[PDB]
From a paper:
Here, we employ the intracellular antibody to identify a compound from a chemical fragment library that binds to RAS proteins adjacent to the effector binding region.
Protein crystallography was used to determine the KRAS-binding site for Abd-2 and for the truncated analogue Abd-3. Two different mutant KRAS-GppNHp proteins, G12D and Q61H were crystallised, and the crystals were soaked with compounds to yield high-resolution structures. Thus, both interactions stabilize the terminal –CH2NH3+ functionality in a different orientation from the one observed for KRASQ61H, but it is directly influenced by the packing in crystal form II.
Residue numbers in the entry: 1 to 172
The structure:
Amino acid sequence: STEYKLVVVGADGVGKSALTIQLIQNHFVDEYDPTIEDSYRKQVVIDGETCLLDILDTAGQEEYSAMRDQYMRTGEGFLCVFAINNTKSFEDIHHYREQIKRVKDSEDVPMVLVGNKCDLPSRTVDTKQAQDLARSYGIPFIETSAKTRQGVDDAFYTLVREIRKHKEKMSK
Ligand SMILES: Nc1nc2c(ncn2[C@@H]2O[C@H](COP(=O)(O)OP(=O)(O)NP(=O)(O)O)[C@@H](O)[C@H]2O)c(=O)[nH]1
Ligand SMILES: NC[C@@H]1COc2cc(Cl)ccc2O1
Ligand SMILES: [Mg+2]
Ligand SMILES: [Mg+2]
């Protein structure tokens, strides 16, 4: 029983909620109901550990940056979601990461870059662009589809492995 606080961040409409609901409830939400904030728990076994995941599913846009600051201080790792057909959402990852680092006063923050909607026929953000940026940041990159469930579990479980690695580091 280790608890892990995961926050799912990203621009409007990239699939934050569809990903999270696939993880928690195992179905795909076809509808677009914009999020205020939602909280979910999931117990899972990852590499033999019993993990309690406390997941925050965030809004695409806040009216209040104090709300953004708060989740950024609370989360232990961040699922940084863009959509592969949304350039601006990819670009926004830079901004999220800079804010998170500021708010935490730290260069070392557990994160996973997620390129969602990989089921779509055309992408405007290429996998190589995204892989190269993740390499730069020293974080994993995973392509996902909440529609088909491709990559959903591996995205969240990878973020847990990154938070474990971080705690291991902050010890030594
Ligand atoms: N084809 C496809 N559509 C998807 C995928 N994920 C989400 N969608 C669709 O994209 C729309 C937005 O999804 P949603 O999960 O609500 O996005 P969000 O990032 O949570 N929006 P918000 O920022 O307002 O909370 C919905 O119509 C949803 O079904 C995906 O992987 N593939
Ligand atoms: N309701 C949002 C606040 C701030 O951020 C949170 C982050 C997590 Cl993982 C859980 C609950 C949280 O509470
Ligand atoms: Mg949402
Ligand atoms: Mg957002």
